[PDB]
Design an enzyme around this catalytic site. Structure first.
Site, PDB file in Angstrom:
ATOM      1  N   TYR A 192       0.818  -1.196   0.000  1.00  0.00           N
ATOM      2  CA  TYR A 192       0.000   0.000   0.000  1.00  0.00           C
ATOM      3  C   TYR A 192       0.859   1.255   0.000  1.00  0.00           C
ATOM      4  O   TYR A 192       1.650   1.523   0.924  1.00  0.00           O
ATOM      5  CB  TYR A 192      -0.832  -0.017   1.281  1.00  0.00           C
ATOM      6  CG  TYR A 192      -1.874   1.063   1.363  1.00  0.00           C
ATOM      7  CD1 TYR A 192      -1.653   2.241   2.079  1.00  0.00           C
ATOM      8  CD2 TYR A 192      -3.109   0.877   0.768  1.00  0.00           C
ATOM      9  CE1 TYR A 192      -2.643   3.211   2.161  1.00  0.00           C
ATOM     10  CE2 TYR A 192      -4.106   1.831   0.852  1.00  0.00           C
ATOM     11  CZ  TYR A 192      -3.860   2.977   1.566  1.00  0.00           C
ATOM     12  OH  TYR A 192      -4.876   3.915   1.626  1.00  0.00           O
TER      13      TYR A 192
ATOM     14  N   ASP B 207       4.105  -7.212  14.608  1.00  0.00           N
ATOM     15  CA  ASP B 207       3.521  -6.436  13.526  1.00  0.00           C
ATOM     16  C   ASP B 207       2.290  -5.674  13.979  1.00  0.00           C
ATOM     17  O   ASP B 207       1.250  -6.299  14.217  1.00  0.00           O
ATOM     18  CB  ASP B 207       3.219  -7.401  12.360  1.00  0.00           C
ATOM     19  CG  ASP B 207       2.859  -6.700  11.080  1.00  0.00           C
ATOM     20  OD1 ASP B 207       2.331  -5.549  11.170  1.00  0.00           O
ATOM     21  OD2 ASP B 207       3.115  -7.287  10.006  1.00  0.00           O
TER      22      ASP B 207
ATOM     23  N   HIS C 251       6.371  -5.698  10.678  1.00  0.00           N
ATOM     24  CA  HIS C 251       5.910  -5.491   9.304  1.00  0.00           C
ATOM     25  C   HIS C 251       7.101  -5.044   8.471  1.00  0.00           C
ATOM     26  O   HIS C 251       7.246  -3.865   8.173  1.00  0.00           O
ATOM     27  CB  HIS C 251       4.854  -4.408   9.354  1.00  0.00           C
ATOM     28  CG  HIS C 251       3.915  -4.442   8.193  1.00  0.00           C
ATOM     29  ND1 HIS C 251       2.827  -5.273   8.016  1.00  0.00           N
ATOM     30  CD2 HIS C 251       3.990  -3.641   7.108  1.00  0.00           C
ATOM     31  CE1 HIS C 251       2.271  -4.974   6.846  1.00  0.00           C
ATOM     32  NE2 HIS C 251       2.946  -3.986   6.276  1.00  0.00           N
TER      33      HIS C 251
ATOM     34  N   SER D 106       2.078  -7.581   2.713  1.00  0.00           N
ATOM     35  CA  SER D 106       0.985  -6.720   3.149  1.00  0.00           C
ATOM     36  C   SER D 106      -0.134  -6.681   2.106  1.00  0.00           C
ATOM     37  O   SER D 106      -0.800  -7.666   1.823  1.00  0.00           O
ATOM     38  CB  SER D 106       1.545  -5.313   3.360  1.00  0.00           C
ATOM     39  OG  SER D 106       0.829  -4.674   4.418  1.00  0.00           O
ATOM     40  N   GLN D 107      -0.354  -5.475   1.551  1.00  0.00           N
ATOM     41  CA  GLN D 107      -1.372  -5.347   0.516  1.00  0.00           C
ATOM     42  C   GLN D 107      -1.119  -6.310  -0.644  1.00  0.00           C
ATOM     43  O   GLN D 107      -2.030  -6.937  -1.172  1.00  0.00           O
ATOM     44  CB  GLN D 107      -1.359  -3.903   0.011  1.00  0.00           C
ATOM     45  CG  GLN D 107      -2.042  -3.754  -1.348  1.00  0.00           C
ATOM     46  CD  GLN D 107      -1.983  -2.309  -1.784  1.00  0.00           C
ATOM     47  OE1 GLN D 107      -2.859  -1.500  -1.520  1.00  0.00           O
ATOM     48  NE2 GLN D 107      -0.877  -1.997  -2.488  1.00  0.00           N
TER      49      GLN D 107
END
EC number: 3.1.1.41
Lengths: 318, 318, 318, 318, 318, 318
Positions: free
Chosen positions: D91, D269, D298, D181-182
């Site tokens: 993201y 995270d 993260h 992630s995204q």
């Protein structure tokens, strides 16, 4: 942290013009006259302390506004008289009056009184809050020199010297004044307002060069002034508040000091910016020395402790 | 930020036992008696304000300790007599007294007075500082209920209602009380100690459930209490300070409120933790509603403003 | 916080050369021509609001790109026509459209419309994202003036004035424009692009002197530009993006304003740096005044609220 | 930093009930149908890159809403047909499309395409902003599944696979999907909605267990949802937004994945909380492995890179 | 973040006078003589790595002080000899030796060795701690050039080049040196102390212009020097420490570099301030280029990766 | 700040099972044997200090690994033989060796030595860095109990006691040990490994309950362990490092202490979490007292200083 104020070469000659109003001297004379009307009535109450070679007490006396000011008073358990020290503390920074520090000074050979500031720890502040102020004591009564918080504090600081010198066990010819930040400002103010002190050691002194302090400090508690102006925004209020502060600004009182002064400044101090301390120092017209520590800020500097002890030992134990 | 206190289901049933001492009622009766000895002597001074439809004034009155309390008073520029509102402000959070907000309240149809808190803005705090306190007002005079800072404030809050209801242009049967945080605490205390208010709207009220507050708050000013215990460490001092706070804890005063109450709480509020607000709410035994906002903290909540306006309109205007 | 930009004495004469490309005027003419092709088709939908003396509605109209823009429209419940105000909001800073504020303006006597910005709150942004941008709206479509996010926003701002002036209850000769930050930029842009406004009050305006803003701002949302350059690093992209921003820079549009302007700036504002605001102000060639507040930043300034109300009351209610 | 979510034993069995609405399958079938109406019309444009052993290109194709989607496509400079990888990015976290990483993947032997996300970098987002949203993309079009931002993104992700498998130099039977992630969320969504992928490696996947995420995440971007509810406070708005998110929640799509999956999670995270990742993992009903790293958050986890390379080598190259 | 050091126009000509003591050259000659007495005794141990086209190993050799230094060594699985690269890592910034990066360099066609720094990762630091130092390695042995931490590190860096050039599969006429921050300083030091390297790419190099670095850096790890002076305050200690640092300052060693250099600097880097990097660059007297990135700090710069790959490909693969 | 660890009732009974390996006793016997092979060869060098009533010296001795250990040694300037104290300092927290504090201890009547920790200040650390470690000393040599950093430190601590008791002016039957954090851990380890101490006062002791510490501490330096696992991720490495720490964990050494112990813990301490301190305390099987301070963290506690002085006075002076 890191450097942020004027470079050292510029700091050395930084000396703002005095901001003292025309009635500055009259204000202090009248204020001391008011203090003199209050009988000190000192009271000494022994305290149980876990150490040999010292007698510790709670000293309490009356000052300006009939306020009850106290602090720990520790004396070498020896036949005096003794050299003495009046130690002043930092803003909102006394934790039970620093009894251990006072005892150590007595063990070093000095009858020592750690005056606790009215309203901040143990001592009473009988002065009211006449017009509302920002959080803290810096703006309490700031719209009039007569009601300003530090009027009472400075007078209490002078009374502390009058009371300790009055003791048979204290050699009034050998009394020093010392303190850090707010305690450093009180040290200079006391030496400027009383002929009692014989020597003064002030760590990065507070309450100096207000006009610059509010535009350069990056931490509290100079910034309480700015906070007060956010909450009371009339242009007239700002002018009046800066005028009352000028009566308490130690750079204005500094030229009254007649005894030797030892001062310190850490170049990364964002509480009492170096410029503000150099301003006070450059206004002194007496035997003086300013110890500059490049890597220290607003905190205890071990090397300066050595200098402080050697200075008091040389002058007060001569 | 994010959630941090008890989960909602647990907040709903959180109701600590009252901490009021055996002489709680006597203390408030005696305090109200001390207030009644002081003649209010209200003074209204018109103020030029850039708006049509309202008359603005600086309202000043005498309260507990002969203190001069003031604030802006705005009235609809129409023949009364008008419903009215006493608005109380947050801790150290009045900026020139919120004159604009008072005017808006009057434009909404309410003769409104924004009481400014003694020592925080404009209003005088004649109570002294008897024993030294941590930075701020929370611990000023905390070693005795008679000297505690909020004693004067609560009485001032009740006196505000007495003064506004005495005006011929104010319908004494249609007066509301409102405020946020400290203002919310004052709102509840006033409704508890005075039969004048007909409705109360308190935003996340402060000065509630002190034993829990000092252990769960993550921001000031609750933490000034903790700061005072750091600087005054005697075990007895802590016990005494909590005892004095119990006389001012709104959860102990809540059962005295007998008019409708509307309250708000943001679930991410780290200043007035949700648990402390639910404690006050759960001690109310009156028509009441607690509006819970999951995504808001200690701040203005737009949806609650609508609830507040709707509530006062319904009760004070019909 | 504290001072950080150029000293006030330097700020007073800070006036960068305009950065407007040779086709600047042609771009705005063509853009307004595009807007004119879209029929406004205004629709007013009443809303239930808890206050007397005002009628509140949801106003919706069509603008550039056939976008549906809305906002709250509040009118004094009196026989007009009324003076009016178009209020523009801050970047990502509208919470349910500030309905309470709009109602207060109506209570002050102005038919007021709070335009909500396309894509940010309630209003539709029909412009696509042609090439990818950093998080936020500042770089959306930045590689071409025709696709840039603020093209649609500025046109919507002008349309808002055309729509409110069209109302029988609005005296189109007495319409003001106002707003803070992004709302201040829209206020200047609207007054520069439309002959409708009669007076403008802009708080620390946003979208000014981009070249300086990206090198001096210390907070968001100018820094989204920097973020876009981190993610799209070709030298050509930076040149193109600065060129498109120059068409929207209010310092370039400022000399088109022909009505009185009242502006504010807080010297510690790190969002809309003082230099950037002085740049816009110094480019105005009209009746103007810049109120400087030393102790305030990017926030509500109580003293300036007084100035704003007096200014609109003097010009719009003459 | 440190641990903060459920303890590992509780994470292992954390499996919230699915939140998919009754028409979840119909929505995805209809969405895929809307995608199929748009001809991909892939375009390959060679790019000069400073490396031997690989051919690099800018790959562009048409997707949902006629959007132009692009990214770098790197292929081993050897005769195919080659195993391939579609890599999805984080993201707002693509910096010029990670061309270097794509080249490295090709040097590892995989024809690799790094899909750039519509509106975030290079790729066009033709979907409008129908109702206004909080800063960011998370709430863009959230009031309707048909207009929600991730509808277009997920379809673009599936289309990427259709395009790469159509190339003669790509072995359509040996294609993997990967991302963080995204990128991890896109990896799972693509494997759920397309039978093309033969293996999936997802780093701490985002877009999972939204009801828990908004209450436990301590960093963005999950919190954009919370931000949108602050700015659009109607209770119905919150219900509608959560309903639209449920159509895109990877925990609801997980049971559709039928190829091997390798996933990672760092226990500290705070962006994609461990609970949210375990929720997605526990809904997978396929050959799967979840690698847990106690001391990572993260970020890039070196040990997992080895696991990822080993997994694709084993499956896609044998 | 944002700009903070000297403006770019000033940075371009920033060139402090060298601080090298009179025995600078003698110190390096003697140090290299000491290193030469230790037989390298290189050992290669294959490692299982999940990739085709490369052979990976753990390379270990003996260096100054009989220290065992190691790192990952990856070679194209082709018939050499190959061009080669010695990659040096950042301060306390190696996570398991960056094996993946080393493998990618080999896939790009270079026999690559990532030297791991003694004491920081996997390699042994046999030098003692002679006098106590601040937390970290920056002040370890700082009171004497012979015992200083970087003496061993720089010698290890030169030995790394002697060992890789000794391999039959390495074309010793085509060896490059590269690294970031501390790795950039080692890259310059290695090229200054050994005639082996043929090309050097240094990201924002560390260990440059110490006198300025300690007064301008705002982050770690230059500030460890300041920390050491806080803990060891004699004036003499500061003088001695700056003198030993001058023997390792890359601005003093820079004029010895005889091969092409490519360097980068991000203007918002507060770790290796731009001034310090320009100082090193302006002391180079060789084919050189400094790529300045306005929007980047102390981190990976995608555009510079392109430049680095093109530079090594042009010089080393000619 | 505020509370964060287990509630007090749970802390009171928190007593993890010992983690000492089967050869724990053998390791300490062998380590003491290695220490005994090194002749102490104490050297006393007078130092001029600005105080009367005390003789100050720099005391240097040889310890484990032939390391030169030093510190200030201050003695009452009176005929002995005197009670004595060995004071140990915090991690990276000695500023020039706390000479002032040592002098104060002597003025209190104790021949006092402030051991400076090898590698941290003044004292030499002759142990090498065998395998690379995270920034700091916590992980230096952690892969083997024989090479671990605290092996040398603990032995140095025992040797300090052997040296001071050997002085004719020191009453070997009246020696105490004291220190904070790391100093507190050393205090307990020394009392565990030596029968010399007659009393111990440990402030919030560090180096306790490592398995819990790394999961609950929120500040350094405990977290250096976590940092090392991030940089050296092999599962076996983590197991080995925890095993070596178990030999130095004071909770494993606590059952060996047989003299009176006074300990402190602040409930908001995030460096040495309360749980870790209660673990050490609950493993002591001797006359003991744990003073709990609710409002203090990892810092000087004024009330505890009184307890400490009272305890040593009672035991060492009577």
């Amino acid at each position: 942290m890191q450097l942020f104020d004027l470079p050292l070469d510029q700091l050395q000659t930084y000396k703002p013009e005095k901001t003292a109003p025309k009635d500055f001297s009259e204000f202090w004379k009248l204020s001391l006259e008011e203090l003199a009307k209050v009988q000190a009535e000192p009271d000494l109450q022994p305290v149980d302390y876990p150490a040999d070679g010292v007698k510790v007490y709670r000293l309490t006396y009356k000052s300006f506004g009939n306020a009850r000011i106290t602090g720990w008073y520790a004396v070498p358990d020896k036949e005096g008289p003794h050299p003495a020290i009046v130690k002043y503390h930092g803003y909102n920074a006394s934790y039970d009056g620093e009894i251990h520090e006072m005892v150590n000074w007595a063990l070093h050979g000095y009858a020592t009184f750690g005056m606790l500031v009215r309203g901040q720890q143990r001592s009473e502040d009988t002065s009211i809050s006449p017009h509302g102020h920002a959080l803290g004591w810096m703006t309490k009564g700031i719209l009039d020199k007569d009601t300003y918080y530090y009027r009472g504090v400075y007078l209490d600081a002078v009374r502390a010297l009058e009371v300790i010198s009055s003791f048979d066990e204290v050699d009034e010819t050998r009394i020093g004044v010392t303190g850090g930040s707010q305690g450093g400002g009180l040290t200079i103010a006391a030496a400027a307002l009383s002929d009692i002190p014989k020597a003064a050691v002030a760590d990065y002194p507070y309450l100096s060069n207000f006009e610059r302090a509010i535009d350069v400090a990056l931490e509290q508690p100079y910034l309480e002034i700015n906070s007060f102006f956010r909450r009371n925004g009339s242009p007239e209020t700002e002018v009046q508040a800066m005028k009352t502060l000028s009566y308490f600004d130690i750079m204005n009182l500094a030229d009254r000091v007649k005894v030797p002064v030892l001062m310190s400044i850490g170049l990364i101090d964002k509480v009492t910016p170096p410029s503000t301390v150099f301003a006070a120092y450059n206004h002194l017209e007496t035997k003086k020395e300013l110890k500059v520590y490049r890597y220290f800020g607003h905190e205890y500097i071990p090397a300066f402790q050595t200098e402080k002890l050697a200075f008091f030992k040389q002058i007060l134990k001569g």
